[PDB]
Amino acid sequence: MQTVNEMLRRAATRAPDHCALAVPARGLRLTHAELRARVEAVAARLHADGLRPQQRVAVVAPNSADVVIAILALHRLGAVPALLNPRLKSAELAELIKRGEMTAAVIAVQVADAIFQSGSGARIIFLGDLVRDGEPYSYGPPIEDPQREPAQPAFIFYTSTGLPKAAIIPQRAAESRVLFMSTQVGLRHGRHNVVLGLMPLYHVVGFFAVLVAALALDGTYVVVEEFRPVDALQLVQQEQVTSLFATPTHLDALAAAAAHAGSSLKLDSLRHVTFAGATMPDAVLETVHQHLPGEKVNGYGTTEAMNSLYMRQPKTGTEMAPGFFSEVRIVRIGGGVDEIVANGEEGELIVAASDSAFVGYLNQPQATAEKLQDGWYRTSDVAVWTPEGTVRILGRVDDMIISGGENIHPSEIERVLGTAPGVTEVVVIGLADQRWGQSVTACVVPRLGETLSADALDTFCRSSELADFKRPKRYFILDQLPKNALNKVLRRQLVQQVS
Amino acid sequence: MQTVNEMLRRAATRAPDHCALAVPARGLRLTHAELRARVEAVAARLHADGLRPQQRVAVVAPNSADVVIAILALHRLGAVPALLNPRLKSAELAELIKRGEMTAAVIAVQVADAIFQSGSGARIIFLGDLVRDGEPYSYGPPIEDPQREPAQPAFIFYTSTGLPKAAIIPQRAAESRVLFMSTQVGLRHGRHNVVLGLMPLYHVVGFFAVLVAALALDGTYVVVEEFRPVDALQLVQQEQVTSLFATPTHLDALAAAAAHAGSSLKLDSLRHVTFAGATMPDAVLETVHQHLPGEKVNGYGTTEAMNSLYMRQPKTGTEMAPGFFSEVRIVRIGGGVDEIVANGEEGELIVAASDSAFVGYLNQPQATAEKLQDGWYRTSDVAVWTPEGTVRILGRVDDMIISGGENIHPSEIERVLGTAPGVTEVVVIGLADQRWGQSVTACVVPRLGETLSADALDTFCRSSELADFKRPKRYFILDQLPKNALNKVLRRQLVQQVS
Ligand SMILES: O=C(O)c1ccc(Cl)c(Cl)c1
Ligand SMILES: O=C(O)c1ccc(Cl)c(Cl)c1
């Protein structure tokens, strides 16, 4: 094995005086040497306050040099961090820590009350009581490196039917979760590496593939506390960013800035632009190609298994192929891992549960047994093999629509309607109905000020590429879609509100 | 873990119909699918002939598609191949198999008698009785994949005082022995990969970093049964070679051909030229830069621990720095791993005994305990830290010369004398003597036809860069140097022949 801790420590010894963390806004830099000292010291101080290996500690913070120190220090201690989205509802967070049977929670958010008053046995730690603006608050004797087993829990990330599940990431999962950035994305070891921390740390990509990779390759992690497209493009040039991994939205922002930015603005050093673009619309992709530099690679992955597919220089966003570490198959929906589909027939994408795999969801054994089957991980996504020997992601099995014996993916239809003039957003659901089973229904929201009509949206679709049966049978023009705390559509529920 | 077998199998499933092996001379190609079938079938047939996991089998063959199949098939079975240099003396090979307590030996060499008559309990298998020109001889039912433990032995390579020691390479060592080609050398996963098999398979680089890497990255291994510089340069262009790892001699041959080859001869696709160039003279290096394309990377490594240092685009051959997976130190010669030297003081290079490390020499526990110390591997090489924070390899501790309290590395002096006009080869030894301890002595061999004199070689050195004390105190002009079966100088013994 090489654990996270080990990866980062060996790095320290290879490049003590090279820059590890940079918060350019706060005019802060730490070398690898300096960043080890602060992990060490915080680690000791949390241990001095009585808090042992294998104990789960929650982390609720937005991206900052301070939380990076906090998380590493916990792992260095031996505590198993459970990283949580700070945009979750107070209620929700308080719940997951209660369920999580967690010894403490480091927070930088208040929402503190929602916890202190959750009835949870969870010692509430203010983040700024540990470290703040780099140098931390230290006492206790330098503690020892605890033994770590390959399958022992190491970190806990959250996914999402009901409340988000808690995926346990074993110690042995770190390496391939990092190195796929190198085998797939083309990063190599070296002090030239300057990685821009745009992806949140509470996400496996933001943590393993961005933070950890950047450090473990003896490079520099550039901290970003708040995303602004121009400021970011400025960081690239100013910081010598060599690679960045960004969400489809981030990219759209960046590509348009770069376009309305002539070359002002030398993005020369940017060599890799990486993204999980299964859901990236065709339009955005190509503004990314036209307007941003460096090699673009498209990746598909999951919290459970990390990276499963990719495309260098992608033409579309849906169509990818497995790289190093991965093994994949497409099996009949609801059926044995061994039931590979014909070719051209759609099915569930499933991927080998090797070393990068999680070990189960904390305290959800049915959930786990729904997902880890005979040493395979079940994506719950629907794919098909292209005659070109690649995998086309069609959409989530859960969102699939079954309309008189036929397979309809709301996402396809959402991508066409999304371009109809006048449409600010759309979700396509299957109304519990007839023709039969389910009738394809479009819920669309107009651009500020503007009118839509079902007639006009139908003619638009009629003029479009969609096969007969895919066309919506019905439209509801709404002035907003109900979403959860995480800007994401309450599908099951929208249905109640329209049927 | 990811074992060799697993790496190659997962590849098979990602790229069944892509080309794995190519013997262009014999006009032979196999896809990954085809290459699995033949590993499977041979594996079964050796198992059918009664031969179980963990049993050591010797392999004595020059590079060929057939031996690649043989070796993989043994590992797939579960047998632990011990790969041996075919240029070893009949006597010598017969010995190492006796010592090795080996159940069988696959040979393609005769020298067969030297074994059949060695008194060894070693079933002699002709290679051509198993597989020949691709398709093999098959019987038995398809056997099962045996369980493999991370520290379980997996392969056995040979190094070299007396007879070469047998380094056991555990199952868990495969991955980083492959992936350092990607973190250091910059190879990424992909069917574009075309790797030229110039390095022999009985060498860890030839096996892990060349064969296995090429396959495991879903690429193509180009078989080379015999090295000819022009033929090779032709293979590059013709084969679309993307990378090659070659010995300092191979390179010299290739660089001179490319130079006396205009561009005839488009070496466009060659992107990585890699070598262990610690001993590469300054002249050759730079003909490699002037005359060969693609990125040049210099590596230092050992059988015991694989890759420990490297330089992208190297200026000299002696000066390198640790990459991903490695941890290194320079400690006082003969002393505790914890005795780091001052800075600028010379010492023994030692490297962390992590996952890529061997587990010991087969049946040499003192030897092992001389080499694996408190979880470090001891290179027995002498290095120094440059003020530039890099490691300079000076030479082997064993060849070091101690001349009145001073450290002299024969290799430095050998590099200067090697350019003196009229010198075809030179070795510098320390005569057991005075001034004291040891007197620096040069043994040189003239160019065909030519004369040398000590006077003239002294004036040459006098005109050269060497510091006072390094100059040879004595010359012996010899018309050959005694070498072992492996074209390498019998240092200890030359001394007898001159003193
Ligand atoms: O959540 C995802 O989309 C995701 C998660 C992990 C990885 Cl590696 C990738 Cl490429 C994507
Ligand atoms: O034997 C060597 O020189 C050697 C052995 C292994 C490696 Cl990886 C390298 Cl870079 C060199």
Three-class HEC string of B124-188: EEEHHHCECCCCECCCCCCCCCCCCCCCCEEEEEECCCCCCCEEEEEHHHHHHHHHHHHHCCCCC
Q: Give the separation between CA A33 and CA A218, rounded to whole angstroms.
A: 11
Q: Which two tokens stand for residue B45?
A: 């047939």
Q: How far apart are CA B359 and CA A446, in angstroms?
A: 67
Hey, what's the torsion of the CAs at A466, A469, A471, A472, to 10 degrees?
A: -160
Neighbouring-strand partners of residue B23: B28
Contact A26, A226 (CB under 8 A): no
A386/chain B closest Cα distance in angstroms: 14
B5: Cα separation from own chain's centroid: 22
**CA-based torsion, A40, A44, A46, A52: positive or negative:** positive
Question: Which stretches within B242-364 are classed as H helix?
Answer: 248-259, 282-291
User: What one-character-per-residue DSSP string does B392-417 give?
Assistant: EEEEETTT-EEETTEEE-HHHHHHHH
- Determine contact, residues B105/B115, Cβ cutoff 8 Å: yes
Residue owning the nearest CA to atom 1 of ligand 1: A302
Pair type for strands A272-275 and A295-302: parallel
DSSP single-letter state for residue B480: -
Enumerate the β-bridge partners of residue B377: B351, B372
Peptide bond just before B490 cis, omega within 30 deg: no
Which positions ≥6 away from B449 have C-beta within 8 Å? Answer: none
Q: Nearest bound ligand to CA B326?
A: 2
Q: Characterise B106 by phi-psi region: left (phi > 0), alpha (psi -120 to 50), beta (else).
A: beta
Q: Are the C-beta atoms of residues A181 and A272 closer than 8 Å to each other?
A: no
Neighbours of B239 (CB within 10 A): 17
Termini Cα distance of chain A: 53
Classified as helix, coil or strand, A170 is strand
User: Using CA atoms, how far apart are residues B278 and B247, in angstroms rounded to an integer?
Assistant: 11
> What are the phi and psi torsion angles at A134 (to 5°)?
100, -80
Chain B residues with CB-CB distance to A14 below 8 A: 321-323, 326-327
Q: Rounded CA gap, B371 and A144, in Å?
A: 27
Residue A229: name the closest of A204, A246, A205 by CA: A246
B316: Cβ contacts below 8 Å, ≥ 6 apart? B282, B285
A255/A284 Cα distance (integer angstroms): 8
Residue type, B375: G
Tokens of A418: 């999304």
Going by DSSP bridges, is the β-strand pair B153-158/B166-170 parallel, antiparallel, or unpaired? antiparallel
Cα→Cα distances B467→A143, B315, B413, B464, Å? 49, 22, 10, 9
DSSP of A418-482: TTSTTEEEEEEEEEEETTTEEEEEEEEEE-TT----HHHHHHHHHTSS--GGGS-SEEEE-S---
Domains of chain A: 1-170 (3.40.50.980), 171-317 (3.40.50.980), 318-397 (2.30.38.10), 398-499 (3.30.300.30)
A3 touches B: beta carbon within 8 Å: no
| Residue B102: φ, ψ to 5° | -100, 130
Phi, psi of B32 (to 5 degrees): -60, -40
- CA–CA distance, A147 with B241 (Å, rounded to integer): 44
For A236, the enclosing helix (H) or strand (E) is helix A229-239
- Helix or strand or coil: residue A221? strand
Q: What angle do CA A212, A217, A220 make, to 5 degrees?
A: 75
Q: Which amino acid is at B264?
A: S
What is the four-CA torsion angle of A191, A197, A203, A205, rounded to 10 degrees? -40
* Six token digits for residue A197: 């921390």
Bridge partners of B395? B382
Can you tell me the distance from the alpha carbon of A291 to that of B410, in angstroms, rounded to the nearest whole number?
57
Cβ contacts of A131 within 8 Å, gap of 6 or more: A38, A42, A66, A69, A70, A137
Q: Alpha-carbon distance B101 to A174, whole Å?
A: 39
Residue type, A387: P
Torsion angle, alpha carbons of B128, B130, B135, B141, to 10: 170
Per the CB < 8 A criterion, the answer to whether B68 and B91 are in contact is no
Which of B312, B324, B352 shows the shortest C-beta gap to A217? B324
Residues 6+ apart with CB under 8 A from A380: A348, A396, A397, A398
**Which residues lie closer than 8 Å to B262 by C-beta, 6 or more apart?**
none
DSSP A164: P
Tokens of A417: 């309607």
CA nearest to A174, candidates A212, A220, A211, A146: A212
How does DSSP assign B20-79, residue by residue?
EEEETTTTEEEEHHHHHHHHHHHHHHHHHTS--TT-EEEEE--S-HHHHHHHHHHHHHT-
Helices A229-239 and A248-259 meet at what angle, rounded to 10? Answer: 80
Ligand 2 pocket residue status of B205, Cβ below 6 Å: yes
Rounded distance, CA B78 to CA B43, Å? 9
B184/A188 touch (CB, cutoff 8 Å), yes or no: yes
Best residue of B9, B17, B188, B391 to probe chain A, by most A CBs closer than 10 Å? B188
Question: Which amino acid appears at position B5 of this protein?
Answer: N
Of the residues A4, A36, A187, A188, the best mutation for testing chain B's interface (the one with the most B CB atoms within 10 Å of its CB) is A188
Angle between helix B410-417 and B454-462 (nearest 10): 100
* Structure tokens that stand for B16 in this block: 């069944």
Residue A59: strand pairing partners: A83, A106
DSSP reduced 3-state for A298 = strand
DSSP state of B199: S
SS3 content of chain B, % helix, strand, coil (to 5): 30, 25, 40
Q: How many helices, marked H, and strands, marked E, lie in chain A?
A: 15, 25
User: How far apart, in whole angstroms, are the C-alpha atoms of residue A255 and residue B371?
Assistant: 55
**Per this entry, what is the length of chain B?**
499
8 A C-beta contact, residue A168 and residue A356: no
Contact (CB, 8 A) for A105 and A71? no
The two structure tokens encoding residue A310: 């990719």
Smallest Cβ–Cβ distance between B188 and the set A13, A183, A352 belongs to: A183
Rounded to whole angstroms, the Cα distance separating A87 from A160 reads 14
- Are A72 and A119 in contact, with CB atoms under 8 Å apart? no
